[PDB]
């Protein structure tokens, strides 16, 4: 009833597709008229924040 | 105890649901007036980019 390889395929396809799609959404949103002048929401600034968060979570599980 | 089958069910439901939801968000955002007339944020173009990124990540684990 269960195929682990197929499960991993779908799982990986979903999370990679979602991250890539979310990056683009973030891009469009950072250009939104109602946040301009708020630098907290400038694309580069947000990407830096995000990478920092990722690093600290990854460092926890992978040297 | 920790039921692995139930964990997998919830896991898969979340990631599939999120990818489908994010596809729709991407669609709506692509139509946003502030990014209209920008070939960078045209739906078809972004979908192509995304699929390319998925391919290269999938090919890494699944020959």
């Amino acid at each position: 009833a269960f195929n682990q390889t197929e499960f991993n395929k779908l799982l990986l396809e979903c999370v990679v597709k979602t991250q890539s799609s979310v990056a683009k959404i973030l891009g469009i949103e950072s250009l939104s008229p109602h946040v301009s002048g708020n630098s907290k929401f400038e694309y580069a600034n947000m990407v830096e924040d995000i990478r920092e968060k990722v690093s600290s979570e990854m460092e926890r599980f992978f040297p | 105890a920790f039921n692995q089958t139930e964990f997998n069910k919830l896991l898969l439901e979340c990631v599939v649901k999120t990818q489908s939801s994010v596809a729709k968000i991407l669609g709506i955002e692509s139509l946003s007036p502030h990014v209209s007339g920008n070939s960078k944020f045209e739906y078809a173009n972004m979908v192509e980019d995304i699929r390319e990124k998925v391919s290269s990540e999938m090919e890494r684990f699944f020959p």
Partner: peptide, 7 residues
């Protein structure tokens, strides 16, 4: 990195 780039 620019809006719409993968990161």
């Amino acid at each position: 990195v620019e809006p719409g780039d993968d990161f």
